[PDB]
Each structure stands twice: as structure tokens, then as C-alpha cells.
Design an enzyme around this catalytic site. Structure first.
Site, PDB file in Angstrom:
ATOM      1  N   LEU A 123     137.217 -16.453  83.340  1.00 11.84           N
ATOM      2  CA  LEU A 123     136.346 -17.545  83.761  1.00 11.84           C
ATOM      3  C   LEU A 123     134.893 -17.093  83.844  1.00 11.84           C
ATOM      4  O   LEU A 123     133.980 -17.829  83.446  1.00 11.84           O
ATOM      5  CB  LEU A 123     136.823 -18.099  85.104  1.00 11.84           C
TER       6      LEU A 123
ATOM      7  N   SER B 176     140.016 -37.196  86.479  1.00  9.39           N
ATOM      8  CA  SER B 176     139.539 -38.223  85.565  1.00  9.39           C
ATOM      9  C   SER B 176     138.203 -38.764  86.045  1.00  9.39           C
ATOM     10  O   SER B 176     138.016 -39.016  87.239  1.00  9.39           O
ATOM     11  CB  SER B 176     140.547 -39.371  85.444  1.00  9.39           C
TER      12      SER B 176
ATOM     13  N   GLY C 140     138.617 -43.809  90.371  1.00  7.26           N
ATOM     14  CA  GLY C 140     137.846 -43.686  91.597  1.00  7.26           C
ATOM     15  C   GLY C 140     138.204 -42.443  92.386  1.00  7.26           C
ATOM     16  O   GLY C 140     137.326 -41.715  92.857  1.00  7.26           O
ATOM     17  N   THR C 141     139.504 -42.184  92.543  1.00  5.94           N
ATOM     18  CA  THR C 141     139.934 -40.971  93.230  1.00  5.94           C
ATOM     19  C   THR C 141     139.509 -39.730  92.457  1.00  5.94           C
ATOM     20  O   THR C 141     138.834 -38.848  93.001  1.00  5.94           O
ATOM     21  CB  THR C 141     141.449 -40.981  93.428  1.00  5.94           C
TER      22      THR C 141
ATOM     23  N   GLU D 271     133.675 -14.665  82.016  1.00 10.03           N
ATOM     24  CA  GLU D 271     133.297 -14.572  80.611  1.00 10.03           C
ATOM     25  C   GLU D 271     133.167 -15.949  79.974  1.00 10.03           C
ATOM     26  O   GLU D 271     132.358 -16.128  79.059  1.00 10.03           O
ATOM     27  CB  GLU D 271     134.307 -13.721  79.844  1.00 10.03           C
TER      28      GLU D 271
ATOM     29  N   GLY E 213     143.940 -36.613  91.459  1.00  8.69           N
ATOM     30  CA  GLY E 213     144.139 -37.928  90.891  1.00  8.69           C
ATOM     31  C   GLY E 213     145.389 -38.026  90.036  1.00  8.69           C
ATOM     32  O   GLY E 213     146.078 -37.044  89.755  1.00  8.69           O
TER      33      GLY E 213
ATOM     34  N   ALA F 187     145.622 -38.928  86.783  1.00  9.29           N
ATOM     35  CA  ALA F 187     145.440 -38.240  85.510  1.00  9.29           C
ATOM     36  C   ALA F 187     145.539 -36.733  85.689  1.00  9.29           C
ATOM     37  O   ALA F 187     146.173 -36.044  84.880  1.00  9.29           O
ATOM     38  CB  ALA F 187     144.093 -38.618  84.898  1.00  9.29           C
TER      39      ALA F 187
ATOM     40  N   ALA G  38     141.769 -44.794  96.474  1.00  5.03           N
ATOM     41  CA  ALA G  38     140.384 -45.184  96.227  1.00  5.03           C
ATOM     42  C   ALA G  38     140.300 -46.509  95.483  1.00  5.03           C
ATOM     43  O   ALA G  38     139.327 -47.252  95.651  1.00  5.03           O
ATOM     44  CB  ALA G  38     139.659 -44.089  95.445  1.00  5.03           C
TER      45      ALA G  38
HETATM   46  N1  LIG Z   1     144.280 -38.215  79.282  1.00  4.92           N
HETATM   47  C1  LIG Z   1     144.800 -38.889  80.303  1.00  4.92           C
HETATM   48  N2  LIG Z   1     144.018 -39.785  81.005  1.00  4.92           N
HETATM   49  C2  LIG Z   1     144.539 -40.477  82.046  1.00  4.92           C
HETATM   50  C3  LIG Z   1     145.861 -40.286  82.416  1.00  4.92           C
HETATM   51  N3  LIG Z   1     146.128 -41.085  83.467  1.00  4.92           N
HETATM   52  C4  LIG Z   1     145.009 -41.772  83.773  1.00  4.92           C
HETATM   53  N4  LIG Z   1     144.017 -41.414  82.903  1.00  4.92           N
HETATM   54  C5  LIG Z   1     142.641 -41.937  82.925  1.00  4.92           C
HETATM   55  O1  LIG Z   1     142.268 -42.127  84.276  1.00  4.92           O
HETATM   56  C6  LIG Z   1     141.645 -43.379  84.460  1.00  4.92           C
HETATM   57  C7  LIG Z   1     142.000 -43.971  85.818  1.00  4.92           C
HETATM   58  O2  LIG Z   1     142.196 -42.976  86.801  1.00  4.92           O
HETATM   59  P1  LIG Z   1     143.624 -42.866  87.535  1.00  4.92           P
HETATM   60  O3  LIG Z   1     144.695 -42.471  86.552  1.00  4.92           O
HETATM   61  O4  LIG Z   1     143.973 -44.197  88.155  1.00  4.92           O
HETATM   62  O5  LIG Z   1     143.483 -41.702  88.643  1.00  4.92           O
HETATM   63  P2  LIG Z   1     142.765 -41.883  90.075  1.00  4.92           P
HETATM   64  O6  LIG Z   1     141.310 -41.488  90.031  1.00  4.92           O
HETATM   65  O7  LIG Z   1     143.516 -41.041  91.074  1.00  4.92           O
HETATM   66  O8  LIG Z   1     142.944 -43.425  90.495  1.00  4.92           O
HETATM   67  P3  LIG Z   1     144.295 -43.910  91.223  1.00  4.92           P
HETATM   68  O9  LIG Z   1     145.489 -43.306  90.524  1.00  4.92           O
HETATM   69  O10 LIG Z   1     144.383 -45.416  91.181  1.00  4.92           O
HETATM   70  O11 LIG Z   1     144.250 -43.441  92.657  1.00  4.92           O
HETATM   71  C8  LIG Z   1     142.137 -44.262  83.326  1.00  4.92           C
HETATM   72  O12 LIG Z   1     141.096 -45.078  82.844  1.00  4.92           O
HETATM   73  C9  LIG Z   1     142.589 -43.298  82.250  1.00  4.92           C
HETATM   74  O13 LIG Z   1     141.655 -43.286  81.198  1.00  4.92           O
HETATM   75  C10 LIG Z   1     146.653 -39.393  81.717  1.00  4.92           C
HETATM   76  O14 LIG Z   1     147.826 -39.234  82.051  1.00  4.92           O
HETATM   77  N5  LIG Z   1     146.119 -38.691  80.657  1.00  4.92           N
END
Ligand SMILES: Nc1nc2c(ncn2[C@@H]2O[C@H](COP(=O)(O)OP(=O)(O)OP(=O)(O)O)[C@@H](O)[C@H]2O)c(=O)[nH]1
Ligand SMILES: Nc1nc2c(ncn2[C@@H]2O[C@H](COP(=O)(O)CP(=O)(O)OP(=O)(O)O)[C@@H](O)[C@H]2O)c(=O)[nH]1
Lengths: 434, 430
Positions: free
Chosen positions: A248, A136, A140-141, A250, A10, A12, A95
């Protein structure tokens, strides 16, 4: 020897992976090209980085995502040659904040390439140890694809340990209102496969960056830099030749006493902003006391309600064992911390003499000594209670359920997910009484 | 989920879409020939979502214009950006239904669906990844509504995997007193609810009354209404036209906004209110525009959100916003009026930021909220249909095409069931 592979599912996941790998290559004297400047001749970092014949050390990591934006942002970024093109995976269909799309409709035609990449990476890994997962819950992804990949990896490898550094959604940085569904579903699916997972509440980290870093708004970049610092502090013992080496296996042995309770709470100190022209260095006892207030953990919860199934300390910086033991003894006098009678004593010592570096340009300030407090407490029960309370309020009227229905899965899956979370909460309150 | 294709139908729809694309090119720094002439790279960051790259770095709209009356063709080449649309996209008929849904949906519909499907397939397999479909059409107009409903049906049965947005224009007696307006409106909204995912009810009644009461336009012609609809439909599409963490795609829009498949009509909101003849408006502060969203006049639906309750709402801010002040202000607004927000959907209030402001002003914000309050719009359409139907008049034109009144009865039944769904979801509580 004890090689490990990090998976970043994803947006994040890939962004936190970029940040943490940047910090790793900074700390281990790894310049961005991958070569060792007068440092090829510690061998602990060989677990995370794979060295080629040319001398460059490409990380043993994979970047997977279902939208091509962040992936080629990383490709076009500052590290073109740091990652080979094969561990970069894109997708024309995302997603779109849907667990069902990222698990059934869209996940299936990419997990095959993902498994191929993982197998190719593990081919050169003789002593395979475990899998690191970054994703994350809200996305969704990052929920559906992560769950499906976890199931596939459990099918393929099995006994190999699996670690999750999962982003816990917060309303401040939320992107979808359907996030509780995705989070609950993915944590229900991965509960029997995630040997140990680290919950990072983005609201707590948001508040930390707002207050400790004195930032008007913690953007995504500062949040990622801080969480990469946290993850590096956690995994330094694995990536460095520490005296009390913890791996891991441990990690599972210590921080996960019960198989169904595998959400350790992390707390790393100190956090000093780059400005003020002075860090005002805190003593070992001071930083030890600074890792116990309810305003420094990775999850917004009160440890007083929680009970310590197991707690571990990992000092990483200019520390001496004598002062570490003195601080531990002083902390033990506090009645605010209590251990379950089944556990002998919720304390552990981890010392890393190497100083902790700070990423250049970051709002964090260099500190000679630091420590991260890893404890498994039932304080996370409050966060889980908030999450499933949101789920119960959300599911009472079948809101947005049709989006999940259209992708094959039905309300039944919601039913066993909700009852599994309920059973998890009774597990918490069962282990919370002595 | 990478490229959006625009679908244009009806004289109202053709005009609004054409000058909307004019505005989009103006704020993206696109010349009347197709070459980029902006300054910031944010304009070209996601320019491919609407435009298609051509020879010599030219950009061409992915808009397909259909209309039986050829007058709209002269009208669309008369104004600016007339030649940017390729002639193959100008597939027009000759007959003209003239306020008759059946005439424009059965007789000449079959003669045009083949060509329009062929061309839309041309860009569909000419595009890397199709986001979905967007439609600008008028519900009252028989030609436009019939052609749009036929397109919706054919694309839904041909592209079930892609989202289908519609910028429908709800007829109003004040702007036009056509008698057959309620019948076509009801049939078209039935076809909408059967096969749409997002629908922005751009009712002309609200446009006319806010033009009269706010912009002091005694006789607002098509120009003023088109100005307001272009402003609001650019404001909503800022999500898809510029990089941002909120509402990246149409599917994300549907996932975040609409909770139920049969509840997908939208309330388009945007502040402030700028007329075509005025450009020296002062820079409204963030609190003024945040509390400006509650006003019905600032709402581009002939509605009153006080009557209904907000299910989900999306807001995007354009300008030199104090982002922390934006978040604090929206949180305070949500807290102060928690009665209208459904407590069983936590954190349903979302806000977004856009660095680029619309050309002409600097201070702006859009309010795309999904609320049951359009229940009264459906009340007004129901009362119009009943008052024009309880005498069983004007059905002979429709029965001349071979179709009976059973379709009218079932469409009315489904619309009444939709109104009942609105009431049940509004009265629901935790
Ligand atoms: N701590 C942190 N949280 C993140 C970051 N980017 C996204 N998030 C969290 O991830 C949530 C959404 O997920 P996405 O970043 O869109 O990742 P995804 O599941 O692949 O969804 P898509 O990118 O649209 O395909 C958001 O509500 C954020 O709270 C980041 O760079 N750092
Ligand atoms: N907000 C706007 N409403 C319009 C505009 N033009 C017409 N209308 C309204 O829509 C209704 C008329 O429907 P249309 O103009 O779409 C008739 P149609 O295109 O389907 O067939 P032809 O025009 O004969 O080719 C009526 O209520 C008008 O008041 C416009 O430019 N803006």
C-alpha cells in the site's frame, strides 16, 4: 507481517467484499470452513487472513451496513462459519440514499461499534499496514458512513495508508437520482484522507459484461464477480509473494505521484466468457495491447485526452519476463501513450507466476495468463467533468437540498464541495500540460 | 424503517383501505383467517412490512379504523376479511360531522385522538422499527378529512422522525355535489402540505370519467371507484411489499421522488385498466403499456401531463417482463418526450421490476410520477373555492365553532403560493 484489514461499507461494499473474499479463498486453497486442506505447512496470504488455534483462517475484514437485509443474507448464506459474528454489523435505520443521514443523523451511533470492531481486529495485527475500503458513491450510506469512518480513522491512526475501492454510480444500475450530490460530497470529504482510491465506473463494467461476457443483462451478481476478479488481480501482488512486491505504501509511491491526484485507472485483460468451448488464448503481446483500448478500462474515459502521470503493469498468470518486456517495448512504440515530463517513464513490471483461478459457476473462462494495467491518467478528468456537470445542473435549482438541510448540514457544505471539485479539475488540467 | 402502520379514516377511506387490505391478502396468499396459503416464498419475504405475526402463524393488519358514523363498521364486517382487523383497532365515534370539517376536527376529535394515539403507540413500541405512517381518507367528507388532518397534526408533532404518506381522496362534483366540498378540501390540503411527505391525490373525478369512458360504467358506484383505487394503491405499494432495488422504503421514496418540501403531491398511474366485471383481458405487450402511461385516462388524476412537466417518475413492472427490452423501451420513451422531463434533473426517469403480477392479470405496470401538471387540479380547486367563496356564503357553520375566516384566508394564500411554486418550477430551465 504487513497485515491488512478490509472494510466494506454499505450494501455494495459488503456484496463486493463477499465476492472478492470468495475468490480469495478459492485461489489460496481456502475451503469455506477456513481450514487448510493439506496446505497449512506461501505465507503471503497471512496478511489478509488471520489464523486461529483451531486452524481456520477467518478473513481480517469487517461487514458494516445500516440495513439488516444483506448482512443476514451473508450470515444465512454459504459462509455461516467463514466470518465470526462480531465483524457483522446491522442497523435498524438506513441512510436511504442520503449522504446527510448516513453522515450525521444515523452514522454517529454505529461508528463507535465500527471502531471497536476495527480495534479488535487490529489487536492481533502486529505489523499494521493499511486499510481497504469498499463502498458506493451513489448510495447514501456508502458515501456518508464511509466519509465519517474515514475521518474517524484519520483521527485515530493517521499515517496508516488507506485504500478505497469505491463504486462509481451509473444510470444503468442507479438507485437514486440524488446520487451526484452524495458522490461529490463524499469524495470531497475523503479527498484528504484517501491516500489512493480506485474508481470503478459501473457503466463501463456493465458494458464489459454485456459484450465480453455476451450477457443480455449484467445483473448485480455478474458485475460483482467481475469487479472481484479485478480487485483480486490488483491486490494479488500484496497477497502473493511476487518478485517485485508492491504494498500500500508502494501503491501510494507509484500510482499516486501527486497527493491530490489519487485515482488510478485499472485495466485487466483478458475477459473471455465461459462458453464457446475455448477461450482462444491471447498472447502476452496480445493481452498487453488488449489493456489499452478505451473499451476495457474500469472508467468510461478516453486515455488519448489523458496524460499518464504514472502507469504500472501487473502480469498474473502463465507469463515469462522476456515476453513481458517484449510486449512493453512494442507498446512503448505507440504514440497514443504519452507521459508527463515530470515523470521519468510511466511503466512498471509485475509478474505473478501463479495461474489465475476463476470462481466456479462464473461466466468468466479460465485463462492461463493475465495482466492488469494500473495507470494514473487525466482521462478520469472526463468522468469527473461529467459528474460535476451533473452536480451543477442538479444544484442550479436547489432540488432535494431540503432533505440534506433537515439533517443539520446546509447549502454551504455543497458550496465548498463544488469549489473543491472545481479546484480538482484545475489540478487535472494543470498537470495535463507539459 | 422496517414496519409500516396503516391509518384509516372516513367512510370512503375506511372502505378503500379495507378492501385494499383484502386485495393485498389475496395476492400475498393470506386466508380470511390470517394464515399463509401461498406457494412462492416471495410472498412471505417481506410480509411483515404490513402484517403483524400472531399466534399460530396468523397475520393481522396494522390498520386503525376511525369513523364517527357506525355504519362503516357494519359495512366493513359485511364484506370479506371483516374479522381479520382486531376490534381494538375499530375505535369509532357516534356523532358524525356530516360534511363539516370543523365539527369532525374540534368537537369529537379530542374524544378520539387520545384513544387512537394510545393504540398507535401500542403497535409503535410493539414494532421492531416503524417505517412511517400511511393514511387513506377522503378530503371532501368533513368527518374523514377532519379526523385525518387531526391525526396528521398529532403524529407529526409526536413522530417528526418518521415519514407520513397519505392516500387522500379529492372530492369531485360529479360523484357528489356537496356544496361544502371546496372549503373542507382546501383546509385539508393546507393541513396536508404543512405536515406530509408523500401524498397521492386520488381524485374521484378522474375515477368517474375513466370508468364512464373506458369501463362503460354509466353509474359507477363506490365499488368501481374502490376497485380502481385498490388496483393503483397496490401497484404503488409493490415497492414496499416485495424485495426490490428501487424504492425500498418510504424515506427512499421521498428522497428519490419529491425535490421540494412543499411540492409532494403525487400522480398515481397504472396500466392497464381492468374492471371488476371483466377478467379475460389479453396480455398487453410492454410497448403498449409503456406508451399507455402518457394517456390521461390511464392517469388516475383528473389531469393532463401534457400541460405540466415531469420532475421525477417511478415505474415498477409486474409480469414476465423482458427486462432488457423494458430498459430499452423506457429509455426510448424518455428520449422521444424529453420536453416534459426536466433537463436540470439528470436520470430522473427510473424503472423497477416485480416478479409477482397482480392476481387476475399477468401484464401490468405502475407509473408513480411527480409532475407539476397537478397545477390544473389546484386551479380547479381554487376556482371552486372562489366561486363558492366570493359571495362569502356557508361560513356560518364554521364560525359557529368559534374559528373565524382568517384560517380560510391563510389556507387560500398558502395554496395560491403553492400554485405559484408549481408555475415557477415548471417554467424553470437550464
Ligand atoms: N458494482 C456494484 N455496485 C453496486 C452494488 N450494489 C449496489 N451498487 C451501487 O450502489 C448504489 C446504491 O447504494 P446501495 O447499494 O444502496 O448501498 P448503501 O449506500 O448502503 O445504501 P443502502 O443499501 O440503501 O443503505 C447503486 O446505485 C449501485 O450503483 C453491487 O453489488 N455491485
Ligand atoms: N372513490 C370513492 N369516493 C367516495 C367513496 N365514498 C364517498 N366518496 C366520495 O367522498 C366524498 C364523501 O366523503 P366521505 O364518504 O368520506 C364522508 P365521512 O366518511 O368523512 O363521514 P361519514 O360517511 O358520515 O361517516 C364524496 O365526494 C363522495 O363522492 C368511495 O367508496 N370511493
Amino acid at each position: 507481517m504487513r497485515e491488512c484489514i478490509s472494510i466494506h461499507v454499505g450494501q455494495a461494499g459488503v456484496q463486493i467484499g463477499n465476492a472478492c473474499w470468495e475468490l480469495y479463498c478459492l485461489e489460496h486453497g481456502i475451503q469455506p470452513d477456513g481450514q487448510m486442506p493439506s496446505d497449512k505447512t506461501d505465507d503471503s496470504f497471512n496478511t489478509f487472513f488471520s489464523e486461529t488455534g483451531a486452524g481456520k483462517h477467518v478473513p481480517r475484514a469487517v461487514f458494516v451496513d445500516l440495513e439488516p437485509t444483506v448482512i443476514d443474507e451473508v450470515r444465512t448464506g454459504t459462509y455461516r462459519q467463514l466470518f465470526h459474528p462480531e465483524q457483522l454489523i446491522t442497523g435498524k435505520e438506513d441512510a436511504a440514499n442520503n449522504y446527510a443521514r448516513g453522515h450525521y443523523t444515523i452514522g454517529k451511533e454505529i461508528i463507535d461499534l465500527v471502531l471497536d470492531r476495527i480495534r479488535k481486529l487490529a489487536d492481533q495485527c502486529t505489523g499494521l499496514q493499511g486499510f481497504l475500503v469498499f463502498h458506493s458513491f451513489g448510495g447514501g450510506t456508502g458515501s456518508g458512513f464511509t466519509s465519517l469512518l474515514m475521518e474517524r480513522l484519520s483521527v485515530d491512526y493517521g499515517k496508516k495508508s488507506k485504500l478505497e475501492f469505491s463504486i462509481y454510480p451509473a444510470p444503468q444500475v442507479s438507485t437514486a437520482v440524488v446520487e451526484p450530490y452524495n458522490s461529490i460530497l463524499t469524495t470531497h470529504t475523503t479527498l484528504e484522507h484517501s491516500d489512493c482510491a480506485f474508481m470503478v465506473d459501473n457503466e463501463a463494467i456493465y458494458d464489459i459484461c454485456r459484450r465480453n461476457l455476451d450477457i443480455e443483462r449484467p445483473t448485480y451478481t455478474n458485475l460483482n464477480r467481475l469487479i472481484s476478479q479485478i480487485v483480486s488481480s490488483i491486490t494479488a501482488s500484496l497477497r502473493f509473494d511476487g518478485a517485485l512486491n508492491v504494498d500500500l505504501t508502494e501503491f501510494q509511491t507509484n500510482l499516486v505521484p501527486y497527493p491530490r491526484i489519487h485515482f488510478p485507472l485499472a485495466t485487466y485483460a483478458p475477459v473471455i466468457s465461459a462458453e464457446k468451448a475455448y477461450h482462444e488464448q491471447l498472447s502476452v503481446a496480445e493481452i498487453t495491447n488488449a489493456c489499452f483500448e478505451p473499451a476495457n478500462q474500469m472508467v468510461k474515459c478516453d486515455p488519448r485526452h489523458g496524460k499518464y502521470m504514472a502507469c504500472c503493469l501487473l502480469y498474473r498468470g502463465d507469463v515469462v519476463p522476456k515476453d513481458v518486456n517484449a510486449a512493453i517495448a512494442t507498446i512503448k512504440t505507440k504514440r497514443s501513450i504519452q507521459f508527463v515530463d515530470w515523470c521519468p517513464t510511466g511503466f512498471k513490471v509485475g509478474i505473478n507466476y501463479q495461474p489465475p483461478t476463476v470462481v466456479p459457476g462464473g461466466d468468466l473462462a479460465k485463462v492461463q495468463r493475465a495482466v492488469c494495467m494500473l495507470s494514473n491518467t487525466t482521462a478520469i478528468a472526463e468522468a469527473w467533468a461529467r459528474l460535476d456537470h451533473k452536480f451543477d445542473l442538479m444544484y442550479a435549482k436547489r432540488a432535494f437540498v431540503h432533505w440534506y438541510v433537515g439533517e443539520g448540514m446546509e447549502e454551504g457544505e455543497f458550496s465548498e464541495a463544488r469549489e473543491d471539485m472545481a479546484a480538482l479539475e484545475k489540478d487535472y488540467e494543470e498537470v495535463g500540460v507539459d | 424503517m422496517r414496519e409500516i402502520v396503516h391509518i384509516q379514516a372516513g367512510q370512503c377511506g375506511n372502505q378503500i383501505g379495507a378492501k385494499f387490505w383484502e386485495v393485498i391478502s389475496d395476492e400475498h396468499g393470506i386466508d380470511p383467517t390470517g394464515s399463509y396459503h401461498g406457494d412462492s416464498d416471495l410472498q412471505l419475504e417481506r410480509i411483515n412490512v404490513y402484517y403483524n405475526e400472531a399466534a399460530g402463524n396468523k397475520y393481522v393488519p396494522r390498520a386503525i379504523l376511525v369513523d364517527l358514523e357506525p355504519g362503516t363498521m357494519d359495512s366493513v364486517r359485511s364484506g370479506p376479511f371483516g374479522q381479520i382487523f382486531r376490534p381494538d383497532n375499530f375505535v369509532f365515534g357516534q356523532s358524525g360531522a356530516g360534511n363539516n370539517w370543523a365539527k369532525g376536527h374540534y368537537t369529537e376529535g379530542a374524544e378520539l385522538v387520545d384513544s387512537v394515539l394510545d393504540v398507535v403507540r401500542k403497535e409503535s413500541e410493539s414494532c421492531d422499527c416503524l417505517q412511517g405512517f400511511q393514511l387513506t381518507h377522503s378530503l371532501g367528507g368533513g368527518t374523514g378529512s377532519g379526523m385525518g388532518t387531526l391525526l396528521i397534526s398529532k403524529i407529526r408533532e409526536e413522530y417528526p422522525d418518521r415519514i407520513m404518506n397519505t392516500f387522500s381522496v379529492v372530492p369531485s362534483p360529479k360523484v357528489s355535489d356537496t356544496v361544502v366540498e371546496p372549503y373542507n378540501a382546501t383546509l385539508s390540503v393546507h393541513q396536508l402540505v404543512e405536515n406530509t411527505d408523500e401524498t397521492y391525490c386520488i381524485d374521484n373525478e378522474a375515477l368517474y370519467d375513466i370508468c364512464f369512458r373506458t369501463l362503460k360504467l354509466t353509474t359507477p358506484t363506490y365499488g368501481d371507484l374502490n376497485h380502481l383505487v385498490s388496483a393503483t394503491m397496490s401497484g404503488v405499494t409493490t415497492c414496499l411489499r416485495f424485495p426490490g432495488q428501487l424504492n425500498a422504503d418510504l424515506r427512499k421514496l421521498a428522497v428519490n421522488m419529491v425535490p421540494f418540501p412543499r411540492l409532494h403531491f403525487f400522480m398515481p398511474g397504472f396500466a392497464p385498466l381492468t374492471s371488476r366485471g371483466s377478467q379475460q383481458y389479453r396480455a398487453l405487450t410492454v410497448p403498449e403499456l409503456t406508451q399507455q402511461m402518457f394517456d390521461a385516462k390511464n392517469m388516475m388524476a383528473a389531469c393532463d401531463p401534457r400541460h405540466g412537466r415531469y420532475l421525477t417518475v417511478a415505474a415498477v413492472f409486474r409480469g414476465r417482463m423482458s427486462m432488457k427490452e423494458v430498459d430499452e423501451q423506457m429509455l426510448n420513451v424518455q428520449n422521444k418526450n424529453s420536453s416534459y422531463f426536466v433537463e436540470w434533473i439528470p436520470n430522473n426517469v427510473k424503472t423497477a421490476v416485480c416478479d409477482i403480477p397482480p392476481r387476475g392479470l399477468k401484464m401490468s405496470a405502475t407509473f408513480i410520477g411527480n409532475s407539476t401538471a397537478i397545477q390544473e387540479l389546484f386551479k380547479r380547486i381554487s376556482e371552486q373555492f372562489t366561486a363558492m367563496f366570493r359571495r362569502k356564503a356557508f361560513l356560518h357553520w364554521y364560525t359557529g365553532e368559534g374559528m373565524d375566516e382568517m384560517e380560510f384566508t391563510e389556507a387560500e394564500s398558502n395554496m395560491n403560493d403553492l400554485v405559484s411554486e408549481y408555475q415557477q418550477y415548471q417554467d424553470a430551465t437550464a
